[PDB]
C-alpha cells in the first residue's frame with residue numbers, strides 16, 4: 001500500500017528497510033487465490049537472476065503463459081486435487097502477494113483514493129504463488145500439498161491469508177498446523193490470518209504456537225464523504241464513490257421509508273415522483289449498499305445516504321452513483337430531520353482520502369478474530385496486529401469492485417479489509433528480518449516482532465477495540481502492533497525448535513498416532529515418555545496465558561531468553577505490571593549475559609488473589625525493551 005509502510009515507520013533513511021535490503025533475495029510463498037501476472041507489482045526491473053537454490057517452477061497454459069513468471073514472480077502452482085491455472089479470477093491472491101512483496105508502482109490509487117506509490121513491505125522480495133483457493137473453497141489436502149511444496153521449492157516465508165470461516169478445528173485437523181510444523185525445521189516462518197469472526201471471543205484460527213497469528217487493525221486514514229443538513233448539523237460519512245462529482249449544492253432530502261414501499265431501496269420500491277432531484281436515505285439490508293444506489297438512480301434521485309447497522313464506519317463502498325455511508329445513530333438523526341422538518345435539505349461533501357490523528361489509530365478491527373486460543377488456553381492468540389482495514393494493493397483484471405450488472409470497472413489497485421490484509425504486512429516484515437538476520441530460527445524472528453510490538457495508539461492511550469470504543473486486551477491485539485524498526489534489534493529472543501513443538505503436542509494429550517501426523521513417521525506408543533514440558537504454558541513463548549482452575553490457584557512457567565544483541569556483556573532487569581487480582585513473581589529478577597552464558601532461564605509465578613485480567617512484564621538493559629503480555633482467565 002501507498003501509506004502503510006509510512007504508518008509502520010519503514011523508511012529508506014534507516015531501520016529494517018535498509019538493513020533487510022527491502023527483502024532482496026528473500027522468497028515469499030503466498031497460499032491464496034493465485035495471481036494476476038499481467039500487473040505492474042510483478043515488474044522485475046533492476047533485479048538479479050533467480051538463484052539456482054530455487055527448485056520452484058511455473059505451471060503454464062493458454063490462460064497462464066510462460067511469460068507470466070519472470071525474476072520477480074518466480075513460482076506459480078495450482079492445487080485442486082481437493083476439488084485449472086494459478087490465475088487469480090478473485091483478486092484476493094493479487095492483493096495479499098502484492099501487500100507482502102509487490103514491486104514499487106508509481107501513481108497507484110483506486111480512482112484517486114489512497115493515491116501514492118504502492119509497495120510490498122518486502123519490495124525487492126521474490127514471490128512464489130501457490131493457488132489453493134477455488135469457488136468451492138480452500139481444500140485441506142491442497143493447503144497441506146502447497147505448504148509441503150513451498151518447503152521443497154525453498155521459500156523463506158509462507159504468507160497464508162486462509163483459515164476457518166468461524167471457530168477453529170483442533171491442530172491435528174488443520175493443514176496450517178501440520179504444514180507450519182514441517183516448515184519450522186527449515187527456518188521457514190509461517191504468517192497466517194487470525195480470521196474475520198470478531199469481535200466475539202475464541203474465534204482466532206491458525207493458532208498453532210509455531211505460526212505467527214496476525215490480527216487486523218486500523219491506520220490513520222479515512223475515505224470521507226460527510227453529510228451537511230440545512231439546519232447546519234454535520235455527520236461523518238464514508239465513500240469510495242468513483243463517478244463524476246456531485247454539484248456542491250444542498251438538495252431536498254427524503255427517507256426511502258416515506259418515498260417508497262421499502263426503507264431498504266430494493267429494486268422498484270421508490271416512487272420517482274417523491275425522489276426526483278432528492279438525496280434519498282436508504283437503511284442497510286437485503287441488498288448491497290451499491291445495489292441501493294442503482295435503485296435511487298433508476299428513480300431519478302440526485303444522491304443516496306446509506307445508513308449502516310453499526311455505530312462505526314469501515315471504508316469499502318465503491319458507489320457507481322453519488323452516495324456516502326453513515327452510522328446507525330447518525331442515520332436516524334438524518335431520517336428524523338427528513339420526516340419532521342418543514343423543508344429538509346442535505347449536501348454530501350466528498351473530502352476524499354484523509355490522513356490525520358482523529359480518530360486515533362491503530363484500533364483493533366471489529367471483525368478481527370479474537371482469543372482466547374479455543375484449544376490451548378495457556379497459549380495467547382492472536383500474536384500481533386498489523387494494518388488490515390481499507391488497504392490498497394493489487395487486484396484481478398477479471399473482477400469488478402462489486403457484483404452489480406452495471407459495474408464494468410477494471411482496476412489495478414483495490415481497497416480491501418480483513419486479517420487477510422494484515423497477514424501479508426507481517427509476511428513482508430518477516431522477509432525483511434530474515435534478510436537482516438539469516439541465522440535466526442523462525443521462532444526468533446517471530447519473538448522479535450512480539451517483544452517489540454507497541455500497545456499505545458497515536459493519542460498515547462492503550463490501543464482500543466473498534467467494537468467497544470474502549471481499551472482492547474491481549475485477546476484482541478496479542479503482544480501489540482508490529483514495530484518493524486524496533487523488531488530489527490530486539491536484544492533478547494524466546495527461541496524454540498521442533499523438539500519443543502513435539503513436547504507441546506505431548507503436553508496437550510495427543511497420542512503417538514496424532515504426533516505422527518506432524519513428525520511424518522509412526523512413532524512408538526510411549527514417545528511422550530521422552531518429553532516433560534508439563535503445562536502447555538511452559539513452551540518457550542514470547543507471551544503468557546494463565547487459566548486458573550480455582551480462586552487461590554498458583555501457576556509457575558519457565559522461559560529461556562537468548563541474547564541476539566551485538567554486545568555479549570549485557571545486563572537485563574525485569575519490570576512487572578501485574579494483572580489485577582494476580583501477584584506476579586519473577587526469579588531471577590536480573591539476568592547477566594556473557595560470552596559463557598548467551599542464554600539464561602527464569603521462572604514466573606502467577607498467584608490468584610481474586611473473569612479475565614491482563615498485564616505485562618518487560619526485560620530492559622541500556623537500549624532494549626523485551627515486553628511480554630500476560631492474559632489471565634479464571
Ligand SMILES: *[C@@H]1O[C@H](CO)[C@@H](O)[C@H](O)[C@H]1NC(C)=O
Nearest residue numbers: 172509510511512513514525
Ligand atoms: C489416538 O487419538 C485419536 C484421536 O483422539 C483416536 O481416534 C485414536 O483411536 C487414538 N489411538 C489410540 C491407539 O488410542
